[PDB]
Structure formats: structure tokens, C-alpha cells
Structure 1
Amino acid sequence: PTIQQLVRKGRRDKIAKVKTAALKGSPQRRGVCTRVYTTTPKKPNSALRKVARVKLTSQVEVTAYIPGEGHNLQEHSMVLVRGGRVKDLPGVRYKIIRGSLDTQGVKNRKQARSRYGAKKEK
């Protein structure tokens, strides 16, 4: 535009959408697992993804994905959720950390253990 049009109005930058709004500026956030269930992915994929409806201390109800081979999560479980988006399930934007609070590390795991909360067997 004209330099006078720029003087009168100026440049207003675009707005930056908030990412992971339920964490409220925190890396991790604790919650109680209100429900555990399984759901089916989109068109070209086929599995039983393990998800959990949890209630964070932000007083926000969210869905989190449970990674690994297996888990022992039921209702009323202290879980620690963190960021992370899996493309396969459109609704989920959070993942439950394996190896903290009531969430156990996967069993018989011996590669990339840290990301799955497994101790180094001696």
C-alpha cells in the first residue's frame, strides 16, 4: 500500500494459535484416568489404538494415547501426560508417559528403553 496508508494503519501480523492448550504452559501435567478404551484409526490403517479419557489438574478433560506393547491402566489411576500428536487418530494430542506415577514401563523391552520407561537389566 501507499506509505501514507501504512502510516495510518500499519502492519498487523497474523495470530498464532495456541498449541496444547490443556497443559497451560507446563511440560508435563498430572491427571486421573477417568476411562480407558480402544478405538479404530482412519481409512488406510487398521488397529486397536489404546486411549484414555483423563482429567488434568488444569481441570480440563482430554484424551491421551498409551504407547508400548501393554499397560495396566484402569479408572482412578495417577498418570502424567505430555505433548505429542499422532496423525492416525484425529482427536488425540497428548500421550501418557510410561514409567511415572502409576504407569508402568513396558515389559521385555531392550531397545530404546528410555522412551518406554524400562530399566537397564543388570
Structure 2
Amino acid sequence: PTIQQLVRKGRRDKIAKVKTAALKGSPQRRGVCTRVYTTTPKKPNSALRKVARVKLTSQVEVTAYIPGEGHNLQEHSMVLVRGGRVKDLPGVRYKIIRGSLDTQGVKNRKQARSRYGAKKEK
């Protein structure tokens, strides 16, 4: 490419695909869930993972995974959602952060408590 071409046309950059659209410049968002249920991932990973179908306040419906093994979560629950990529599931992008406004911390989890929202043993 001659410099004349560079001058006359330009160097059109890429754009990196901005992930995590629903949060909209937010680290977290607030959610009121529609359905809370379970669904199975792809053929190798034979299991049954726990998911909700949330209506955030960006006015976008999203499937979002629930870490840990316990939930007080059913319809209408008022929760808080954060970002994180799960390999297993097709288009799942968002996780619920436990210990915020409905999600009770899993019990007897005492290693790795900061992430799962667990108070320290006395």
C-alpha cells in the first residue's frame, strides 16, 4: 500500500465486540426474575445446571446462571446480577452474585466465602 493510498482512504480500525450489553456501563444490575429452573448443557458435560430468566432494569431479558448449590429463589425475587462467561451453556453470560437482597449464602461453605457471600465462622 502506497502512502498515497493511506492518505486517500485511511486505516479503518477494527472494533472489539463489546460484551455484556445489558449492564450498559454498569458492573452490576438489579433484577426481578421471571422463571427459575434447571437446564442441561452440551453432550460431554452431562449435568443439570441451575438458571434464571431475569428482567433487568436495562429492560432486557436474560438467562443467567446461579453459582453454588442452594437457592431461596423463585418467581418475583429481587436479586443482583454481575458478569461472567460460562463455557458450558449456549448464550449464558450473566451470573447472580450471592448475598445481595434475596440470595442467602450457602451453608457450611467456609473456604472461599467472599465470592459466595458467607459470614466467617465464630
TM-score, normalised by the number of residues in structure 1: 0.97
**Displacement of 1:72 after TM fit?**
1.2
**Displacement of 1:40 after TM fit?**
0.4
Deviations 1:27-55 (A, max 9, x none): 00001011101000112101110000000
CA distance in 1, matches of 2:60, 2:111: 34
SS where residue 7 of structure 1 aligns?
Answer: helix
**Displacement of 1:114 after TM fit?**
0.7
Q: How does 1:10-89 map to 2 (within 5 A)?
A: 10-89=10-89
**Displacement of 1:4 after TM fit?**
0.6
**Displacement of 1:115 after TM fit?**
0.7
CA distance in 2, matches of 1:91, 1:106: 26
Superposed CA RMSD in Å reads 0.7
Alignment partner, residue 109 of structure 1: 109
CA distance in 1, matches of 2:6, 2:24: 36
Gaps of 5+ in 1: none
Higher helix share: 1
SS where residue 115 of structure 1 aligns?
Answer: coil
Deviations 1:43-98 (A, max 9, x none): 21011100000000101100110010211100000010000011001121000010
CA distance in 1, matches of 2:100, 2:121: 18
> Hey, which bits of structure 1, 4+ residues long, moved more than 3 A?
none
Deviations 1:4-47 (A, max 9, x none): 11110110101221110000100000010111010001121011
TM-score, normalised by the number of residues in structure 2: 0.97
SS where residue 6 of structure 1 aligns?
Answer: helix
Percent identical across equivalent pairs?
100
